[PDB]
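Hi support team,

I'm opening this ticket because the web form for multi-chain structure prediction keeps timing out on my end. I have pasted the exact lines I submitted so you can reproduce it. The total is 342 residues across two entries, so I didn't expect it to be a heavy job. Is there a limit I'm missing, or should I split the entries? Thanks in advance, R.K.
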Amino acid sequence: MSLQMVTVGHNIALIQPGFSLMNFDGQVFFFGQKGWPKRSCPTGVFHFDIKQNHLKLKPAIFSKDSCYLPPLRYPATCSYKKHQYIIHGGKTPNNELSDKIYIMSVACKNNKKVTFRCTEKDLVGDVPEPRYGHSIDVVYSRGKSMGVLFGGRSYMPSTQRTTEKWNSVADCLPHVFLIDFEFGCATSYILPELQDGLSFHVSIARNDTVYILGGHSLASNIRPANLYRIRVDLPLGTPAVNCTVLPGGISVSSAILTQTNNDEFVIVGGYQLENQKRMVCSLVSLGDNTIEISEMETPDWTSDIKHSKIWFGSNMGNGTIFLGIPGDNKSEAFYFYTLRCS
DNA sequence: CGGGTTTTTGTTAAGGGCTGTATCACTGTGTAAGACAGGCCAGATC
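Hello R.K., no limit was hit. The queue was backed up. Here is the completed structure from your submission:
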């Protein structure tokens, strides 16, 4: 419940809104810088380390059999259990969208030096169109794993896309896609309780269930307080997917999800209205089949956040949240605050 | 197609005055960051 000032090094310009911090055994790694990778680091992945409330970036290299990936500004991060992550969707530095899916991992470790193995994965079947601003989770059902994808924005279709509205975006279909990591195949499932496309939501996972919280809908310009309970099941045949609406929803878009302890997450940040930025936090609780969203203490915000207009960040893993605000320009382009909650 | 006759059109010289054009020496627009080689201390080491 503390708010701390953070001093940043020289390449503060390499941090932009929409980045994605990734954790690997107590070590946080930066990703998604601004612009194409320069010659200071031909890969882009940087080591996230905070020492005495000071920020320093450190480059990193890949293995031989890796695949040099372009930076992405709105990917779909997802943990997995050796230990590895999944990246899907996002916007290339050329403002284009990428349908490819990535699997990062650790190759070697020697004296605080980490090597990665970026491996492109082929997707076959009911492949989704290139999306961004969505989420993806992994469910465990009877010793089997399966990826759940939902939401995301995208441009107009190939036909209706005109150069007078070339940057117009539209919410994708509310379809739910199960992604198999072994075969690299997907399957399109439609649900009756899903009517409005959702984006910038928050996905909380469990053993075999995933939960949906808040978001935004371009079709209506409304931030609904929804709570969906998707229980994916993996029998010996075709999987099963079911939805269920639950009371006690939150109206927030682009929130930050962190884990203080098991079966209890903390939500902070986001937006209530167009200009009414969310300030209060939110405490959840994951029981056997129930959920309980409740209010917690409101951390002491400084005079900068209370009168700002926009913010961004992501999770760090150790109950800490990396938060930044827009600075001046003529000066430092941004400021950055770390938040502690444990 | 010619004289007789007529009305238009130049033509010289020198000077005056208004108009147009070449000539002089110059300018303002080509203006922030990144790649790289060399030196150097902190530190794991056999």
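A quick check on our side: Chain A has one domain: 1-342. Let us know if the file doesn't open in your viewer.
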